[PDB]
Write a protein that binds this ligand. Structure first.
Ligand SMILES: CC(=O)N[C@@H]1[C@@H](O)[C@H](O[C@@H]2O[C@H](CO)[C@@H](O[C@@H]3O[C@H](CO[C@H]4O[C@H](CO)[C@@H](O)[C@H](O)[C@@H]4O)[C@@H](O)[C@H](O[C@H]4O[C@H](CO)[C@@H](O)[C@H](O)[C@@H]4O)[C@@H]3O)[C@H](O)[C@H]2NC(C)=O)[C@@H](CO)O[C@H]1O
Ligand SMILES: CC(=O)N[C@@H]1[C@@H](O)[C@H](O[C@@H]2O[C@H](CO)[C@@H](O[C@@H]3O[C@H](CO[C@H]4O[C@H](CO)[C@@H](O)[C@H](O)[C@@H]4O)[C@@H](O)[C@H](O[C@H]4O[C@H](CO)[C@@H](O)[C@H](O)[C@@H]4O)[C@@H]3O)[C@H](O)[C@H]2NC(C)=O)[C@@H](CO)O[C@H]1O
Ligand SMILES: CC(=O)N[C@@H]1[C@@H](O)[C@H](O[C@@H]2O[C@H](CO)[C@@H](O[C@@H]3O[C@H](CO[C@H]4O[C@H](CO)[C@@H](O)[C@H](O)[C@@H]4O)[C@@H](O)[C@H](O[C@H]4O[C@H](CO)[C@@H](O)[C@H](O)[C@@H]4O)[C@@H]3O)[C@H](O)[C@H]2NC(C)=O)[C@@H](CO)O[C@H]1O
Ligand SMILES: CC(=O)N[C@@H]1[C@@H](O)[C@H](O[C@@H]2O[C@H](CO)[C@@H](O[C@@H]3O[C@H](CO[C@H]4O[C@H](CO)[C@@H](O)[C@H](O)[C@@H]4O)[C@@H](O)[C@H](O[C@H]4O[C@H](CO)[C@@H](O)[C@H](O)[C@@H]4O)[C@@H]3O)[C@H](O)[C@H]2NC(C)=O)[C@@H](CO)O[C@H]1O
Ligand code: NI
Ligand code: NI
Ligand code: NI
Ligand code: NI
Lengths: 158, 158, 158, 158
């Protein structure tokens, strides 16, 4: 089981970490969501599907910097919604093919009333999402740690 | 502050996510209304009411599946109506007692003019409603995320 | 292989005909589409999937009455678009399960410039769609003929 | 009157449907433009120009897949720009010769601010464009339905 990003780095069999940059709407008002869909960016696959079933959870999502300070959020994982930062590990998604399948994770972030001017800085760490992978074969229990960075500034109108 | 559901589950202190399975009218004609009343499904209470006031909003309500594609309508939160899907956080409702109070949320849904046959599938996700809880005591700001599923097919007859 | 409608009649193994009523937007201007999605109304299944593959086409779509006189159209079948009335039989869709699967057919109908007042009458025949079913097993070649009737009047504003 | 495509197919007299497979820029940044020029792909001619004038509109253009969700923009039909997806039939272009003339349709597409990673998948449907042909001779009113597919992944970098 391994993962890669749309146009860049991989995390190999056994887990590891990678950095992922995301495009954010440059302007967001209170009562609006920024939607950050990682499923167009993070893809995984099962290496031995005919003999092994891999199980993949969102083990933990965490907020950093301007998202931690200036936004509240929810996370959508495989069709179900959760608070963001997360409060528990999700149910598992099954990976059963050598063909890349997106990791179905999307953040929905909304500015709190204090947000104003640059609520998120360009290039800054906004989130960490931890993909936990297991199987029906052996004791493998691996973390794929995704560090989420903002491409651009996000301004909340004052 | 925590919440429970009718013959099911709980989201404990600090928030979290639950699934809510709701019975729907099997038949709703164009022009007719489908009512999804969560006030009979979702109940919350204040844990230290002698000392704390709890504040509770519908932060966001979103439509999914057949409700998203085949219906339009409103959300009534404690007496006032709003568009659904929502565009802003509602006013607060106070929880000031240890005894279960309904979450006063109801969806008022009516078929699009072109809908017919099976407009909602049994077992499908129809809505996500986020309960945001704060207080007059500390910095607690918790999301209680309700994933609302149809128990049955809803048919718009033709 | 057989088919049924959402809340009514069946066409049995061997083919046959049925009448299907559809809800139409009561008011349509030039440059707007009426969208008639039969996939919420017509469902089919394979009776012996473990041993037989069924193939299902839209063999022909035809317009009648007010649609023939007052609208031009396209038909969407399993993700691809065609003129309506059709000019040939579609590629086939595979049915490989005893579980009901919709027949993925949707009409997109737009008023011609002459349309005015009641362009479609309530209860009138508007379309015939012919489902042709074959298999990889024997010589079975069957027609499921769907007669499409308007529920309500459709008015084109003058 | 009929139409042909670059190294492919034809829709003959009387209209019909074809698939068009188009090469796309592999990378389009937010702020940048993706151009889908069908003028190099779709060619039509008049069969009896000594005697007949053929009239040709873009009757409707619709977006699908990643183009629908991840892009916004316009359609340029013979020099004038319009919203895409479309809201009205365009002016006519005349075909008055037996020699292939391009269908002068081009999509001008730009990423939504929140798009990143794989915004269009290879092999996926991105658009349907309906060519409506009439004449100055008889009642012929024919639809030529072009189903437009991406040949490659289009990545919005982050
Ligand atoms: C069809 C059938 O019944 N045939 C079986 C054979 O499959 C079986 O041989 C074992 O096959 C399993 C997979 O089914 C192998 O498990 C994977 O091993 C790789 C690599 O490690 C081994 O293989 C290497 C060569 O490829 C060798 O160099 C090395 O010595 C090892 O033997 C791991 O990378 C895999 O784990 C990754 O992918 C899986 C699936 O996505 C994830 O769950 C993991 O977390 C991880 O990401 C597998 O573990 C196994 O190596 C084969 N042999 C044994 C005994 O381990 C054969 C027994 O030999 O029996 C036949 O009947
Ligand atoms: C009458 C009067 O004013 N007397 C006050 C005392 O109240 C005060 O002592 C504080 O009392 C408050 C209750 O009013 C306590 O607050 C609740 O604590 C529980 C449990 O917290 C314990 O366990 C936690 C681990 O989960 C620890 O982190 C924590 O330190 C505690 O040990 C919380 O669960 C409550 O919060 C929930 O319920 C409320 C009400 O529904 C919601 O609003 C919240 O969102 C949340 O769901 C309360 O926070 C508090 O612990 C007591 N101590 C203090 C000050 O922190 C006393 C101070 O000594 O002063 C007297 O005069
Ligand atoms: C797993 C395996 O290899 N086992 C096979 C057996 O399947 C096989 O027995 C034949 O099985 C096939 C299906 O695989 C049968 O075909 C269907 O027949 C029914 C009904 O007609 C028969 O069965 C009736 C009882 O159910 C009998 O009363 C009757 O005498 C017939 O024998 C048809 O309705 C089916 O056709 C419908 O459904 C299919 C699939 O959706 C459509 O394609 C058709 O258009 C139509 O809608 C099938 O034709 C078949 O009847 C079984 N027997 C034979 C010889 O015909 C067995 C051979 O006996 O071999 C085993 O190895
Ligand atoms: C110089 C002059 O004015 N002389 C006229 C003659 O034109 C006229 O005879 C008619 O000539 C026209 C061409 O101008 C003919 O029209 C084309 O016919 C073809 C083929 O149609 C034949 O086959 C059909 C089967 O598919 C039969 O149904 C039909 O009866 C014919 O036998 C069509 O394919 C053409 O239509 C296509 O191309 C045009 C041009 O691009 C498009 O606009 C259309 O949408 C379509 O794609 C034409 O229709 C016509 O057949 C001749 N006869 C008549 C009147 O019908 C002559 C009359 O006798 O008068 C002279 O003065
Ligand atoms: Ni691999
Ligand atoms: Ni309690
Ligand atoms: Ni059956
Ligand atoms: Ni020709």
């Amino acid at each position: 089981f391994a993962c890669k990003t749309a146009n860049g780095t991989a995390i190999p069999i056994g887990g590891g970490s990678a950095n992922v940059y995301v495009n954010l709407a440059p302007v967001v008002n209170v009562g609006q969501n920024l939607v950050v869909d990682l499923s167009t960016q993070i893809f995984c696959h099962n290496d031995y599907p005919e003999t092994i079933t891999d199980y993949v959870t969102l083990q933990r999502g965490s907020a950093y910097g301007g998202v931690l300070s200036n936004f509240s959020g929810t996370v959508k994982y495989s069709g179900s919604s959760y608070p963001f930062p997360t409060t528990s590990e999700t149910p598992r998604v099954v990976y059963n093919s050598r063909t890349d399948k997106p990791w179905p994770v999307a953040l929905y972030l909304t500015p709190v009333s204090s947000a104003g001017g640059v609520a998120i800085k360009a290039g800054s760490l906004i989130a960490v999402l931890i993909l936990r992978q297991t199987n029906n074969y052996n004791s493998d229990d691996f973390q794929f740690v995704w560090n989420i960075y903002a491409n651009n500034d996000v301004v909340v109108p004052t």
